[PDB]
């Protein structure tokens, strides 16, 4: 299968900015008939992809002139000249020259914002849950920027891999920050077999892990 | 004008089969290819294969041949995709798209296929109150954990509608055939405990819970 690599994978942009995304194939997409089948689509957060550039540089019909594709053989480039809020979403390049056709990983354009350190809060199981037999320890890492955060559960100093479920919100509408929830589920007489539960987070804002804990 | 309008069963048991349709309108069905593409959320797009409605000829992605089977009914200008022997890895959103041989331009809206062994299940809603003592500065963050429900959606509301500021409802994740969702609400330290906060959770497929975060 041909591999398509897109750069960056996340592009913060202030509205009105110029922006460039790139797509590199693991081999030439020039076809024997001379055409290069490199396409670019935009997926906006709740819907189907919409077509933007066909065969490396030709815009589709209603695509604003702001969009421009460039590149040849294996390295291609999309550029947006004055980004607008309606242009926020995920960008994917597509090679149709080799079977199977493959897409690039996606590049999300998002709003630049100042860094914001997270608010970490850990929650022991409820009386209600323990009475029913289970134990979920929940850690909320609210309102941070940039999206890249790495959270781990360590119960009594061991890092627990198994049993945590994570969920992320989209970039906040009136704030531009991100939020994450991490839930660790054990059984009551299993949770009862240890006592400190820690939720430590690593993020750009702090050189030290953000550690919340209890017993 | 041109519309690929999808429709095809969406909650299915593992080991079964599901046939999803894609009725085309606004252009001559026969002149273009229908391409089908799979998207596993939080991720990229995979090309499954195509059909040429004129001849009935197809080409599949090696990965999907045997799993996907592609079919057209030129009398109704509707194209189908049957998936077979479903497993969890098959829960994704599937798209048909009109296109030429090498690439697609206009895409249909998507059909979400969820593979699960569940029955309809009312959620367990759990209050998540602050850990203890050594915590709060200007704010206190409370939370509602609602778990083990099928199918989607739930309505989580904090104080029956007002208290719109400060909440984040995380997207539901399926884990072991049932879903879990969670919500944080951050309020000022002179608001809680004094002023009671309740989380209200509703599940169309069954019935409603209202839970107060005491302590």
Curated annotation (Swiss-Prot), chain B:
Disulfide bonding pattern of the chain: 144-199
Keyword Transmembrane helix found: yes
A single GO molecular function term of this UniProt record: antigen binding
GO cellular component, one term: immunoglobulin complex, circulating
Major location category of this protein: membrane
This protein's UniProt keywords: Cell membrane, Disulfide bond, Glycoprotein, Immunoglobulin domain, Membrane, Repeat, Transmembrane, Transmembrane helix
Location in the cell: Cell membrane
Annotated signal peptide: none
Residue span(s) of domain Ig-like: 123-215
GO biological process per UniProt: antibody-dependent cellular cytotoxicity; antigen processing and presentation; complement activation, classical pathway; early endosome to late endosome transport; endosome to lysosome transport; humoral immune response mediated by circulating immunoglobulin; immunoglobulin mediated immune response; phagocytosis, engulfment
Protein name listed in UniProt: Immunoglobulin heavy constant gamma 2A
Native species: Mus musculus
Taxonomic lineage from the root: Eukaryota, Metazoa, Chordata, Craniata, Vertebrata
Span within the parent record: 1 to 97 of 398
């Amino acid at each position: 299968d041909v591999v398509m690599t897109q750069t960056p994978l996340s592009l913060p942009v202030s509205l009105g900015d110029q922006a460039s995304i790139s797509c590199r194939s693991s081999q030439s997409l020039v076809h024997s008939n001379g055409n290069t089948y490199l396409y670019w689509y935009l997926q906006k957060p709740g819907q189907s992809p919409k077509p933007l550039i066909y065969r490396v540089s030709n815009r589709f019909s209603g695509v604003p002139d702001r969009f421009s594709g460039s590149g040849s053989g294996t390295d291609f480039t999309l550029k947006i000249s004055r980004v607008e809020a309606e242009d926020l979403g995920v960008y994917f390049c597509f090679q149709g020259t080799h079977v199977p056709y493959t897409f690039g990983g996606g590049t999300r354009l998002e709003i630049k914002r100042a860094d914001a350190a997270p608010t970490v809060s850990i929650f022991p199981p409820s009386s209600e849950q323990l009475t029913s037999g289970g134990a979920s320890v929940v850690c909320f890492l609210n309102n941070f920027y940039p999206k890249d955060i790495n959270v781990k559960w360590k119960i009594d100093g061991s890092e627990r891999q198994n049993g945590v479920l994570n969920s992320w919100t989209d970039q906040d509408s009136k704030d531009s920050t991100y939020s994450m929830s991490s839930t660790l589920t054990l059984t009551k007489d299993e949770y009862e077999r240890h006592n400190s539960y820690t939720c430590e987070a690593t993020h750009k804002t702090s050189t030290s892990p953000i550690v919340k804990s209890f017993n | 004008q041109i519309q690929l309008q999808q429709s095809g069963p969406e909650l299915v048991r593992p080991g079964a089969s599901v046939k999803i349709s894609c009725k085309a309108s606004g252009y001559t069905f026969t002149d273009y290819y229908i391409h089908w593409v799979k998207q596993r959320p939080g991720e990229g797009l995979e090309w499954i294969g195509w059909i040429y409605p004129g001849s009935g000829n197809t080409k599949y992605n090696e990965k999907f041949k045997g799993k996907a089977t592609l079919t057209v009914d030129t009398s109704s200008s509707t194209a189908y995709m049957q998936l077979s022997s479903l497993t969890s890895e098959d829960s994704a959103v599937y798209f048909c798209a009109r296109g030429g041989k090498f690439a697609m331009d206009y895409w249909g809206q998507g059909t979400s296929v969820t593979v699960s062994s569940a029955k309809t299940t009312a959620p367990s809603v759990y209050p998540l109150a602050p850990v203890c003592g050594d915590t709060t500065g200007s704010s206190v963050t409370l939370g509602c954990l609602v778990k083990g429900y099928f199918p989607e959606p739930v309505t989580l509301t904090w104080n029956s509608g007002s208290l719109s500021s400060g909440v984040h409802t995380f997207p539901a994740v399926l884990q072991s055939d049932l879903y879990t969702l969670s919500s944080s609400v951050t309020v000022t330290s002179s608001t809680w405990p004094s002023q009671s906060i309740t989380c209200n959770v509703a599940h169309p497929a069954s019935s409603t819970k209202v839970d107060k975060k005491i302590e």
